[PDB]
Amino acid sequence: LYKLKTFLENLRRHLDRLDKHIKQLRDILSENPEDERVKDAIDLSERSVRIVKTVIKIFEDSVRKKEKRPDDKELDKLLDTLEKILQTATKIIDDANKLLEYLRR
Amino acid sequence: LYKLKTFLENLRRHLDRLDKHIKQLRDILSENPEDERVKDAIDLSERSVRIVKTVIKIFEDSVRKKEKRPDDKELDKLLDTLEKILQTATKIIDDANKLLEYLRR
Amino acid sequence: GDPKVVETYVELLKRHEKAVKELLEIAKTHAKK
Amino acid sequence: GDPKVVETYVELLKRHEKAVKELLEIAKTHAKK
Numbered sequence: 001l002y003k004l005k006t007f008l009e010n011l012r013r014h015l016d017r018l019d020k021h022i023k024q025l026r027d028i029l030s031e032n033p034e035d036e037r038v039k040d041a042i043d044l045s046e047r048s049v050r051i052v053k054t055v056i057k058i059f060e061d062s063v064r065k066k067e068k069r070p071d072d073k074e075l076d077k078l079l080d081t082l083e084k085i086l087q088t089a090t091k092i093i094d095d096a097n098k099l100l101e102y103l104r105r
Numbered sequence: 106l107y108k109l110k111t112f113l114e115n116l117r118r119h120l121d122r123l124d125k126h127i128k129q130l131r132d133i134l135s136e137n138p139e140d141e142r143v144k145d146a147i148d149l150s151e152r153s154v155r156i157v158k159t160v161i162k163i164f165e166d167s168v169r170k171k172e173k174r175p176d177d178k179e180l181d182k183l184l185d186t187l188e189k190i191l192q193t194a195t196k197i198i199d200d201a202n203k204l205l206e207y208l209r210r
Numbered sequence: 211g212d213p214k215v216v217e218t219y220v221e222l223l224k225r226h227e228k229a230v231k232e233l234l235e236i237a238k239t240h241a242k243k
Numbered sequence: 244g245d246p247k248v249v250e251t252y253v254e255l256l257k258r259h260e261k262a263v264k265e266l267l268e269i270a271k272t273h274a275k276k
Contacts, residue, residue: 037216044223051230058237078240085233092226095207099219099248102203103211142249149256156263163270183273190266197259204215204252208244212254214247221245 003079004066008059010086015052017093021045021100028104108184109171113164115191120157122198126150126205133209 022045029038127150134143 041223044227048227048230051234055234055237058241062241078236082233082236085229089226089229092222096219096222098207099215103215146256149260153260153263156267160267160270163274167274183269187266187269190262194259194262197255201252201255204248208248212251214251218245218247
């Protein structure tokens with residue numbers, strides 16, 4: 001249980017990071033509608049936001065359903081795997097943010 | 106006089122910036138001799154260091170020779186121009202440092 | 211900015227989309243599990 | 244790192260070399276002046 005909550009909380013921290021990133025893309029893009037690659041960046045980030053929302057709701061489903069109860073090793077290995085994937089994602093996002101800061105300033 | 110000293114001091118601040126940058130390239134390169142483009146980067150930065158040293162000594166010459174005395178408008182416009190070029194150079198260096206930080210981390 | 215930087219940035223975004231799609235396939239198929 | 248970033252970085256270094264060469268030509272020809 002503690003691990004499910006901790007991972008989901010990590011997911012939501014990551015989602016807030018993405019929302020800041022997309023507010024920043026919003027400013028930048030709004031300055032230059034001229035660039036359709038900024039259009040892409042915005043679209044891709046929004047896709048990511050929708051997918052993370054869907055995954056957060058899927059694990060909300062799973063988490064409350066599991067709360068409704070008192071084989072587990074596969075879920076634990078999936079937890080390890082999702083944590084590693086999340087780590088990769090945050091690394092990517094931090095690199096993206098650094099490039100974006102280079103590009104805005 | 107004050108402007109010559111201020112510009113030369115700006116030049117030396119810039120040179121110290123470059124020396125930090127090249128210490129950092131030294132660390133990075135030393136980790137990966139594998140990259141001859143890091144070899145380039147190092148060489149180019151060292152060329153820049155030598156040229157800035159030569160310019161600092163050229164203006165040291167000019168500055169002390171001018172101290173030896175009590176037409177000037179051309180020197181003042183050259184001061185404006187060298188200041189603008191220096192501004193461009195520092196902008197380039199800060200962008201370079203940001204990319205380098207992205208690349209090292 | 212130099213579009214080399216921008217293209218690398220977009221590539222990062224695409225890597226991120228792919229990793230999140232992996233997350234989602236895992237989440238869905240584990241919910242089924 | 245993605246060599247797009249590295250090539251842009253090297254291009255920055257080259258721009259810097261060119262600007263400093265401009266500085267030097269100015270410094271030399273002003274010393275002559």
